[PDB]
Every structure is written in C-alpha cells, then in structure tokens.
Subunit: 280 residues, 6 copies
C-alpha cells in the first residue's frame, strides 16, 4: 500500500485523511502542485516548488518548510514508495481554525504529499468563463477548482474530451487543466498567462519552440483564431503535449495530429528523458 | 466530546476526517450550509436544505439522501450532542475518484454534518477584489470554493475592517464576504438583487419583516455613492443575524451607532427566532 | 407553384430572385418578420408590422408602403396562394446603390413577402455571446443573423436541439431564435428584452401568465437559475411554446414537459384559434 | 454590359440575381472579399483568397472550389469583361435550405464574383456604436453581416464625417467602418493589434513598407487620448489605399494636410501596386 | 454689480476670486448645485441642499454650515442682489492644503454662492438635435456620476463632441451600452404612450427628473424606470431631457434621425406646461 | 513672499487668486504639470512641456504661449523667486465663460505657474505601505487617465481610501482587473530579476517612468511592459512607484503582505541611486 506524506509522517493511502475542520476542506483554502517523475528523476522539481510558494504567498499562507525541506520531502516520499515513474500532488492548506473564514485564527498549516504510480482530443468551448483576474486569480493553483470542474462537466455533456475557456473579454484562456497553443501558417501563438496559469509545461514548450526557431507570439486570441488554426494542442504536467484534432466538432487540419505538434511532442519526450532531480 | 455525522455514522470530532482523495478536499468540489438552532428549535431548516439541494444540482451532484432524510440526520446529530443552541454545518462533497478533475469517476458522495454549541456596529471596508462572476463561479452556489471570500477577509483584516464589502465587475455592490447587505436612506430600504451575491435565508426573512412593517423597500442595484450617503447600513446572515454597520471605509454611518430602522428589524427578527422553527426534542 | 410578393408583383418561387447588388444581400442591410396564419386568419398581424417598422427606423430605412398597405400586401399574397395555415416572412432591404456601404446612395428599398404552407428540446449553452446592445442591437430583427447561426452551429455539434445565449454580462439572453422562460417553485421568470428581442409570442405568453395569475418576474438571470429551474421553455412564432427538458445534458424536472409549460401551451393554442385578421 | 460570375456561368449584371431563399440574403450568411486590379495585374490576389477561405472556415462553410480554381475564376471574370483597372467582389454564400437558420439543411453554396471598372485628407468622427465583439460576431470575419459597419457609417453621415472610427467595448480604438487605422506620434507609428478589427491586406503591406523604411513601429492598443494627440492619422484598405485623416472629431490633425510619413508610405505603396501582382492577360 | 457669497462676505463678482491653492481649483475637489428662483420663490431649495450634503458626504467633505444656515445664505444672497428670477450655484470646496492630493492636509473648506439672473425659442415648436457620443459616462466605481462634483471634464468632453458633430445636446451611454443621460440633463423617452427613463445609478438623481415623474404619475401616464439602449432611442415616438437650467427640453432629432415629425411630442408638451405651472405654485419665498 | 506667474504678471502667493467663474474652478476644465528643479537645473523641462501641450490638445484647449515662451516663463518664475531646488506646477485653464459647460463660450485661457521650494526618511530602509483600492481608475473612454487634468477626484477618492485603510499609498486597478498605477505615480514590479510595468494606456505616460526604463535598459536588467494583476503584485520580490514629486519610492508592504523582507529591494535601491545621479547631471540651467 502506497504511503502519503502527512506533516512528516508516512501514512498508508487508505488511512490518509484530513480533519473535516481543515479550511482546506471547508473552504478550498490551500494550494497545490502537479509534478512528474520519469525513470527515477523528478522533472522540474524546483520550478514547481517555486510556483507552490508563490501561490501560497498570493493567498497569504506561510508554508512551514523551507523550499529545500519541501524538495527532500517529495523525494523521501517517492523513495518510501519505491517509485520511479510517478505523479506527485503536493498540497498545503490553511489548517484548522474557528469554523468561520478568518485565516488569522488558523495557526497550523497542513502539508500533504501524494505520489501515485504512472488520434487527438475533441475539444469544446464552454459557456462558463474562466475565473477573473480580479476575483479569483486563475494563476493561483488553489484548491478552488470548481470553475474548472464546471467546464469539465460541460465538455462531458457536449461531446468533448477537453473543455476550452474564454475569459470575460472574449479572449481564449486555456483548457480546464492545461494551457493552449495554436499553429497557423507555421507561426505558433499562445495566450499571455495573465488570464490562465503560468504552466511549467508551457514554459518548456516555449523554450523548445525558440530552439527550433519556429516563429512564435504570446498574444491574445479569439474564436476566429481557434476555428481557422492549422493545428491546436494543449499542455500540462499530466497531459504533456496533447494534440487537439477537433474543436466544437470542426476538424482541425486533416483531423490527425499536426506536423508541428508531433515534432514538439518528440522534443518534449527527450527533455523528460534527460533532465530532473535524482530520487535514488 | 461532540460527535460529527459522517455518512450515517457519529464520529468523535477529533477523529472526524475525510480521505485526502475526496474531491471536496482536492478541488473544493462540494456544497455547504449554515443553520442556527435557538432554544431547541432549528430556524429555517427546510429553506436551508432546499438551498443545499439547489446548489448541489447546479454543480451536478446528487445528494444520496432524500430531503426528508437530510432533515432527520440534522435533527439526530443535534440530539446525539444534546444541543439546544447551536450552529450547524452540513456539507456534501463529490467524494473520491481519479486524482484528476472529472466528476464522472466519483461514484460516491460524502455527507457530513457538524454541530457546534452557540449596542455597537461593525466597521466595514470595501475591497479591491471583486465578487466571483455570475458566468465563472456563480456566487449563488454556497460551495466549498470560498477563497474569493477569504481573499476579501484578508483585505479587511489588513485594512481595519471587521467586514469586507464586495463589488461586482460592473461596479455594483454585491455583499459582505459572508453576509448580504442592506442600506437605509430617507426611510427607504434598498438591497441588491440576489444575482451577483447569494440568496440569503436571513435576507429573505428580513424582507418579510420589512413588508410586515410597511417600510418602503426596493430591490435594486446600488453603488459606492449609495453606501457612502446611506443613513444606515446593515448586513445579514445565519451567524451574524442582523449586524449594524456603523462605519464604512472609516466614514461614520449616521451617528456611529446602530440606526432606528436596523434596531426595529433586529427586535422583530429576534421574535421570529424565538417563535418559529423545527423542534429538536419531539 | 407558390408566388412571392416582390415590390407589388407576384412571382413564382423558383424565379423569385434579388439583384446581387441589393445591400440586403451584400451587407444584410434590411429587416424581417415572421408571422403565422392559423385556419384562415393572421395571428398578431398588426403587432408584427409595427415591430417591422420600428426595426426599419432603427436602421434608418424608410419602408415605401404605409402600414395598411403592408397588411393588404401580406393578405393579398396569402389569398393568391390560397393559404389558410402558413408561415409568412416579410423582408424590407436597403436596395441597390454604389457597391460600398453608404446607405445614402441607395434610393429604392426593396419589399419581399414569402408565404409558405404550414418530449422536449435538449438545449445547450453556447460559448458565443449574443450581439451587444451597443454594437448590433439584438432587438433589431435584421438580416444580420450570423451571431444566431454561429450559435446554432455550436448546438448542432454539441448535442443540442436549441442553442442558449448569454450576454457579455453573463446574463441569460435567449435561444438562437426564441425567447426563454424559466419556472421555479411556481414562479415564472424571463429576462428583460434589452439583451434579446421583444418577442410577440413572449408578449402573448406574459398576458396568459397574468390571466392565470401565476407569479411572474421580468429579471435578469444566470446559469445558476437555468441549472436549478423546475421547468424551462422557449417561445417564438414558429416554435410557439417549446418545452426544454434537458440543459447542457442535465435533466430539467423529470425530463418531460412540465405542468406550467403544458398549461400555457394549451392556452396559447386557444388564442391562436380565436384571434387574427381574416384573410378571406 | 459587364458580366457577373455565378456558379461557373457569366451573367449580364442586370440579370445577376440570387434566390430570395439563399441564406446569404435571408441571414447574411456568407463571406466576401475586396480586391484591386491595377493596369492588368491583380494586387495581392492570393492573400485575399486565403482570407476568404479562412473566413468561410470560421463560419463552417465549405467553398465548392479549390483555391486555385477560385483564382482562375477571378482572373477569367476580369478577362471576360476586358478589365485592367478594376475592383473585384467575390462572395460565397451558404445557399438555400429550409427557411429557418440551420445551415445543415443547405446543400449547395453559391459563388459569385462581381467586377467593376475602377492633397486633402478625410474628416473622421468617432462613433457611439462599438465594434462587433470578438466573442459575439468576430470582426475578423469579412462576412455579409455588415450592419455594424453601416450603423457607424449612418452616424458619420449625420455627424459631419467622411469616415466613422469605431472603439471596442474595452474603449480601445478598433478601426474605420471599412478600413484599418494607424497613427504617427513623434516619429513612431502605432496600429491596433488585429484582434478587435480585421486583418487587413493593405494594413499588412503598409507594415512591410514601414519596416523597409525602418520607421519605429508598434502594434499596440490605443485610446482616444492617442487619436486626439497624434501628429498624423491614416486609414487603410483595398479601395481607399492609404487615406490621410486630417481631422478627427472636428479637431485638426497637424496642419490639416496629409503628414510627412503618410505621404512617404503613399508613394511606396503606389510603387508596389505598379510592380507586383498576378497578370490577367497571360 | 452682483455680489457673490464667499464664506460669509459678499463680494462683487469681478472681485470674487479663490486662491490658486484651493484644491477645488487644483483638483476639482468639491461639489456644486444648480437651483432656480422663479418670481420671488426658490424651487426645491431644501431638496437641492440635501443633495449637496450627500455629494459632500460621498467625497468625505464636511460643509461648515448647517443645512438651515445654507438655506439662509442662499436666500440672503438673492436678497442682496434683489433677484426675483435667477439661477443659483452653491459650491463647496476642500479649500487650500499642501500642494499634493491629500485632503487631510486641508483644514478649511470654502463655501461660495453664485446668483445670476429661460432658453430663447419656442420649445413647443423647435427641439434639440441630440447626438450620441463616443465617450462613455464616468463609471459608477471610478468617479460615480451621482456626485455633482467639480470634476466635469467627462461632461465637457461630450459637449465638445456634440459641438463638432452638429448636436445641440450630447447623449452618453455607459460602459454596458445602456443609455445614461445628456451631458447635463436626465433623459426620458416616450413610446406607444409609455414613458421610460433609466434608473439613476449610471447618471445623476435629478430633481427635475423627480418632479417630472411626480407629474407623470398624477397624469396616470404609464411609466417605467428601466435600462434602455440605442434601439429604444432610435425608435422612440418622443424624447426629452430634464434639468434645472433647461427644464424640460424636447429632443426632436437623434444622430441624424427624425423623432416623430420633428416637432415636440404631445406627451412632452403636456409635461412642459404642467411643470411650468408647478414652478409658479411652489417654492420658498425670498421676500 | 514667493511670486506666482499669472498670465504674464508675477503675483505674491497670498494674492494669487482666480475668478470663481474660471471653468478651471467650476468644472476642473484645464491641464497641469509637475516638474522639479535640482541644484539650479530643471529636469526634463521640454518633455513636461510637450506633455502639457498634448493634454491641452486632448481637451481641445489652445495654450496661448508657444512652447518656447512657456519654457521661458517657467525659468523666469524660478529666477524671480531665487529658487535652486523646487517643484513647479504649470496650470492652463479654459478661463471664464458663461456659467454652463460649453467651452466655445470661453475666449481666454488662464496660464498660471506655481513654484515652491525630498520626502523625509531613509528610503533605502523604510518603504511605503500600499493598499489596493475598491475604486477603479478613470476609464480610457470616459475620462482618459493619460490626461494630466484638473479632474483629480478619482485620485483623491483613492487617497481617501488609503488614508482610512492604513496605507501611505493607494494602488488602482482598472475595469479589466489590470493593475493601473498609484494615485499619483506609475508602478513597477520586480520578480526573479525581471522588471515589469503596465503599458501606459490605463494610467499616465510618466516622465519618471520613462527615465527609469532608460536606466533599466542601460543596466541590462530584463524588462517587460505588460499587463499584470493582483497575483503579480502579491508575489513580487520588489515593488516601487515613480513620479516627479516622489521620485522612486519603494513599496515594502501591499494589502497586509510583506514584500521581500519588508525593506527596499536590491534592484530598487540601485535604480534609486542611478536616478539621483541622473538628476545631478542633466537639466536646463536656470542661471
Ligand atoms: C496545473 C495547471 C496548468 C498547467 O501547469 P503545468 O505547470 O504545465 O502542469 C494549466 N492550467 C490549470 C488550470 C492548471 O491547474
Ligand atoms: C451563507 C452566505 C450568505 C447568507 O446566508 P444566510 O442564508 O442568510 O445564512 C451570504 N453570502 C455568502 C457569501 C454566504 O456564504
Ligand atoms: C423573431 C425572433 C424572436 C421571437 O419573436 P416572436 O415575435 O415571438 O416570433 C426571438 N429571438 C430572435 C433572435 C428572433 O429573431
Ligand atoms: C475589408 C475590410 C478591412 C481592410 O481590408 P483590406 O484587406 O486592406 O482591403 C478593414 N475593415 C473592415 C471592416 C473590412 O471589411
Ligand atoms: C445637475 C445635473 C443633472 C440634473 O439635475 P437637476 O437636479 O434636475 O438640475 C443631470 N445630469 C448631470 C450631469 C448634472 O450635473
Ligand atoms: C503626474 C502623474 C504621474 C507621474 O508622472 P511624472 O511625469 O513621472 O511626474 C503618474 N500618475 C498620475 C495620475 C499623475 O498625475
């Protein structure tokens, strides 16, 4: 049985439980990460940690471990589970307090680390818009994911593998759990991150694009751009690079993964084979 | 030790815990209520349950109890704890599934019920952060995604406020971080339409009291100009009841003491909580 | 073969054609109506005419017939086709001018009248928003219907019989071609018309609701209201009252037409049997 | 008499007519282009066709000609009319179907090609009506729904303007009613990003000329403040080419005469239309 | 020479000047009113004063006079100039401070009251030609339009558009595309015998507007306070605007378009006559 | 007593007054500048003048002085008061007209120049405590924030919030939720060694801001002009604001939250020192 890190103890999965009084559970008042181990090494471990700490700062939550201790803890929980290929979900919550909202009454944050062993998508645009930048900033990878879940429920009902959000301005934002890229006449465009999330996989992809010297723009786009694109793909830690071959039932290109997307998938695979922090 | 209802079992508080795999924890993927018991009667029990079932429907969650069984579970939890004056927090979550978002992989929801035992105004401040928008995370869902509200509270804590007041994206007043808002100006009471806030049970009772008293009343969008020129402000909710707001953004509301109308509504509300409700021990 | 009214001539359907230089065709620069004849009488003929003329005024288009002459023309084209149960599509365009946009160069509007013989809907909310009140006012029943068509294309791809628009504020607007009503705990709500279209069928329905003394509100609503509604229906000249029994795959009530909706359908049917202008 | 291309036939202008059942007429359900021929060569023929096919794809319309065949049809229509200096208007519509909206009932699109034979600035005015929004009726589609643009022109006609200037809902400058917009301020040229307007072929040529001349250039959102303080303004499009704007909202732009930079771009553009294009008679 | 009230002193017009350091001047940091005297009586004097004090409260400015003392000051300045028919402009400013924004550094508000002695033209025959402006009304959460403040550049910019674009009157929309008001007057429309006017939130809670609604309800004309848009303006049977200085002004053309027959409408004309009657029959006696 | 330039005359401060009928006073209808003299030299004098003339053009106001005559007037008013270190406030107003809004009825603008003799405190140690305000910045299509106008009540309202809410400095968002600026200073952030500042569209095209970007590019610090939001502010390593009066001011706390260690950051401190050097080495000689 896999062990979960809970505040420094390793607890079997079936017994890994949090107080119902934890503000993480009552109010989604916490932050989280998603990280992959490939063949014994943790891909972009430090970058993910840095984002976690930034998100914690945004919600005014003090993580009770230094960054190095957090990295050790992630590594120790993979070893304890004897994992080499894994998805890792670190979570930091506000902890318990009074029953109300007030985070000043919550003296002890809680730290959890879950480790689990490890043709394109039909995407649909959803009616629901992404969380606004001045209500629930979407750059926060928080435990408030019901915006994302409502979009997923739409896609499930409407013939889609993946939901695509616009923002309130009508700009394309992202998928429900992944950043979005388009290819047109050989130029790649992706939205600026402000209205979506500063994806680590997106950042790797951009480095690859610039190394391949493929023309690239970070620019807001709309429905006209999605429906006229030669290729679409989405990016994220779990999905990696995933081709999107239909959009609202419309065929993208010939309906199979495009040339630029398949090229980047191969380069991305190479980076995951060659980089990372050693677990053992 | 108080006991927590958990899927039909009564569990000591200290051991009342949920799987870290529950999407309620992972994603705030659930709904909740807040209910008061006053001297052995639950106030507005059925209006709370009905709202819970509406919010669950909006997030496409089937609660695995009939409404009648939910009512019985709440009353039984109160009884097991010997409570007569209490605050009650029902929660329903999506339960566990895959580690990803998709609620279709979540076969079994969790039902939890927490019971706890139970003139100067509030100083309010308006916050920079806007209310969750009606086409992103509709504020009418009393869900476990409460970081909008907590972000507002963090502002109020830093800015000298007991209560944070939200605007929406249009610039319309919305509500407090956990309470609806009313103003009084030249004998007329105005409160925002519920669309950009939440359909409060307390707010509804108060409208009823207003209409009994024949005080002129409007449900209409308002802005900062209205807050800053009001004769009285108050907020409403299950825990706070009716709470006068005596300062706004450091500005004195009337004479800084609770206003004539607010006080009259406070008295009438107290009478309702004394005289109506569902009896726990019967 | 059915005849079409074209500027006072009656022209067989197969030869009923408009100059490609008509600004109606080049730029959708015209207005239109939809009207039903039931058993020899034209339902709300004068109301539809009045709306046509209001829409023409909004686009600064002078209709070259008085209102009475327009009514005569509609009646004459139904008689000429010997119709008793019909859909009528009157259309007024800018006419031809210079090839550019300028309506001042277009001296002669064109008047066309088409007459054709005559479980709920699964509705889906669409990603595209309704035309804005200060860009292309949706109260104009104009020949610019591509907003409406793009929504229809979404619904067709996404498992829907009917598309439902929000506006830019997130408020519910209407269906792609019909007004929307909801029923909850016995109260009926419909949006104010500003962000949709002042439907004649909607107006009849409201009169019926007030005669049945059913609690009613004209109030903006959102997704929360649609997904928690006991009943939904849409209204329009062609559709009449149409029950909506699914919304984004979610069951409305028991998945069959609700009690209040079926009651109004029966009352509406009675009004169409008893009112109208006689054709013969 | 000039002939119009209509689904492969060449029809005298006076008899070139489409079914009143065509959704192009009923609902403006189609796309169009605008193209110039200069001294027996078509300027930017392929960039126009490519845009037509993009706009058709966005409205989910399959044009029943390959791009190469469309190019041949345009050139043949010009030849049949003996034209050398011309304005060309290709149109593709959805064709006829049911009388209702649904494009699935429309089996056969219509292809039409119209050919016509072919220093003081414009007075511009800003209009009240905003540009069609990017998530309602995306302005980048050169569709037959042009009433947004005609409403603007009606304003300009009533308000003393040769050209109407749109803002978008954010308050950003968008474009003219049928032309893109550029400003010049202290030696730098700025033009809006295309998202809230239309990806003009003329605008693209002009950016190329700007970059050849090494004049500092920005693609950036601008507002009224920028228009009202500009040293020069000009608009661009196939019919107008580069048109100086010498007044804005009655305010004089520079000295009221076309500006130094605008004039230099006008000369360079004229050279391109003289020297590049697809030959009609070859 | 007319006298201007200036903090209790009465100063000839030509000498009535304020320090260049008054934040009223530097920053538009103050509030104002517009009130009319008709035939020796001040119309809605106490209502205008109540609004002044609310606007002041909104900008966190304490007016150093009781409401009753302000009413006496207005009446006194009228008497000292011997006026029977007049327009009155009370102004309260923040006063002088440091050069910076901060109102805490400003100890002493200035109170000024200007008093000055109807538009030429047969308003039963000839209305205003209105244009809708590109600029939008100041937003309810940036510079709330309900404040009758010295910040009137939004309003002046709209007037400049109108001046340039062949209008006598500028009409604002708000950011939502809802009709707001004219540059200085609330707006009403009439359609199929029903009168509509926007809620006041996006414009200003006009006292003339309020009087007109009272007259409307007396006449039993169907009435709606609702948001409206361009479609409503362009299809209206009648349009008029309202405010203290101009009273009820018909709008007979909008953005080119003829309203009705291009003359003031029947409803408008009836309201104009009733309003003028109202101004003869009510008011606070100056003498 | 210091003298104030007033349409060519030099008037002692205490006598420097403007008519209550000047539309500058009634309506905030005018434009201004803020310029500093350091050690006998005026810093970016011609740039400030160019901005004044652009703001005037935006509000359709013709300044009745050539740019060169305006430069001489500023220099002259400094010399007449014998200043070496000073803050200069040129103002141009619409002038007097009729009582109404209409700027056509206003024949004669007023030109005023105020000249007055650094914030107390170790700015290498102690920064500003900033709060984000509920009120949004004036919108780009209602009252364009790029205009340095006499309509500063949006800015004063934000300051009032800050005063009440424990801030030294108010920070505005715009209607889109993008960070705009402080109430009177542009804003910069620093994160992982990259500096970001908003495009000027939703705020004001600051001259201090422009100087700072020049210094940044000299230092080869990575730099982005991009929109940003609350997430960016709350996670920034450093924050500072910029403007003529305050120069470069570190912001060490935002809405409760400690920025870095609560002291001015390394990048900020380097820019402050370089900026001060710049102000010693450039400028138009007064004498
Ligand atoms: C985690 C996440 C992403 C992608 O981030 P990576 O760092 O590539 O895994 C994108 N969007 C949302 C909403 C997410 O939660
Ligand atoms: C629960 C709640 C309310 C008010 O609810 P009552 O039903 O009166 O307890 C108001 N606003 C928010 C955000 C809430 O969560
Ligand atoms: C015609 C129309 C309606 C309904 O109008 P009726 O007068 O009931 O037929 C609603 N919405 C749209 C978009 C329409 O075109
Ligand atoms: C066609 C068009 C343009 C400019 O196009 P060119 O391709 O340069 O002819 C600009 N705006 C609108 C609205 C248009 O229809
Ligand atoms: C004063 C004013 C009005 C009209 O108010 P009255 O009280 O009727 O004089 C309307 N709009 C604006 C902007 C105003 O300043
Ligand atoms: C003057 C001003 C600035 C700063 O500009 P500087 O030219 O650097 O003095 C920034 N914001 C506002 C609102 C201002 O008035």
């Amino acid at each position: 049985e896999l062990l979960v890190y809970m505040n420094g103890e390793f607890v079997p999965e079936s017994q890994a439980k949090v107080s119902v009084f934890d503000h993480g559970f009552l109010y989604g008042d916490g932050v989280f990460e998603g990280i992959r181990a490939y063949n014994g090494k943790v891909f972009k471990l430090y970058e993910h940690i840095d984002r976690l700490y930034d998100c914690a700062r945004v919600i005014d939550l003090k993580i009770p471990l230094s960054k190095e201790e957090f990295a050790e803890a992630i590594l120790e929980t993979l070893r304890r589970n004897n994992l080499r290929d894994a998805y890792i979900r670190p979570i930091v919550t506000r902890g318990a307090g009074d029953l109300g909202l007030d985070p000043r009454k919550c003296p002890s944050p809680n730290v959890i680390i879950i480790t689990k062993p490890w043709k394109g998508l039909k995407a649909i645009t959803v009616a629901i818009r992404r969380n606004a930048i001045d209500s629930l900033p979407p750059n926060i990878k928080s435990l408030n994911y019901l915006n994302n879940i409502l979009a997923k429920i739409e896609a499930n009902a409407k013939g889609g593998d993946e939901a695509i959000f616009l923002d309130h301005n009508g700009y394309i934002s992202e998928g429900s759990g992944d950043n979005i890229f388009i290819v047109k006449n050989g130029t790649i465009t992706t939205p600026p991150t402000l209205n979506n999330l500063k994806g680590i996989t997106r950042q790797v992809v951009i480095e690859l694009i610039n190394e391949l010297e493929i023309p690239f723009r970070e620019a807001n786009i709309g429905l006209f751009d999605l429906y006229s694109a030669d290729e679409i793909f989405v990016t994220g830690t779990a999905a990696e690079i995933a081709p999107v071959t239909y959009i609202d039932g419309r065929t993208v290109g010939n309906g199979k993964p495009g040339k630029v997307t398949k090229m980047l998938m191969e380069k991305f695979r190479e980076r995951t084979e060659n980089e990372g922090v050693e677990i053992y």
